Design a binder for this molecule. Structure first.
Ligand code: NA
Ligand code: NA
Lengths: 126, 126, 126
């Protein structure tokens, strides 16, 4: 069996962030966005949403919220590919933000590469 | 005291994943496998396991579970070294899976590199 | 409107680690140290603290605690800059350790780089 076994997507949200969707819906939407790229197998996109309970942004005594994602793909794609993927996620994430804290909400997406030569993967059958 | 201060190993398991071992036992087996490589000081191998409470694999309405590790080592080793480390961990992780969701469980391991020139470390004495 | 949208700082502490102050206060100290570098916008420094409940260090049956941070900045800075940033954080972290386990506490800091060409960012207005 040949399978990509990636991408891995980790979405971190401060506990005070308010979204327009449930976390499940956000994960669904992020995964649909990634699948729509045509670069990934449907069952290979593996995403998680992590609530941050202990966070600080800057030094000011200002209530703030933030939302960050890190998309990890296999090495080898070109710059334009990586940039497009990050932008497609950022659109999904930014669109899901209802609000949080007492000012605007920073949304960021990193796209990073995993060394495919050393990436190990298996499926453990049911 | 000269010490490596690494590697760092992070294991992530979806909340629906059943294992044959406790998380702590799985960490012990992973650390044993890493120490058996002969590449690391005994006290320098630092591992942690996290359960992902909010996750989604793909878009299909199929219950799925997955297990992932990210091993971080200092830069400067060759490709063969990195590949071998990842394979060793992948065998441990795959061995630990009992089952989850309604189909097979994808297991993956990334081996990544940390810039040793900027890596800061200290031992705060007892 | 123009904003850095980073750095991102993740601090991980074993559950048995005793700190001189709370996790919130440690995050404040870390953010203050990063801001004092003169390299970052005040609102762009985004930090979070995780307590690790399932952790193992080495293979020996000895109680041990550890503390690790990963600072992620945009690619492009020189070696001396990355090293200085890591050292500044390492000082803060090391100074926060009261104790933990039955021997010294390993403290470490990785400084890693995100690809700026693919890094996507937005502020969702209030
Ligand atoms: Na991981
Ligand atoms: Na985190």
């Amino acid at each position: 069996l040949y399978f990509q076994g990636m991408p891995h997507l980790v979405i971190e949200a401060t506990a005070n962030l308010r979204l327009e969707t449930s976390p499940g819906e956000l994960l669904e939407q992020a995964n649909a966005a990634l699948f729509a790229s045509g670069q990934f197998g449907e069952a290979d996109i593996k995403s998680r949403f992590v609530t941050l309970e202990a966070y600080r942004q800057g030094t000011a005594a200002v209530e703030r919220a933030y939302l960050h994602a890190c998309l990890s793909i296999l090495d080898g794609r070109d710059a334009a590919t990586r940039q497009a993927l990050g932008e497609s996620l950022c659109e999904v994430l930014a669109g899901a933000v209802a609000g949080g804290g007492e000012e605007g909400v920073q949304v960021s997406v990193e796209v990073r590469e995993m060394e495919r030569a050393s990436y190990a993967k298996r499926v453990v059958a049911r």
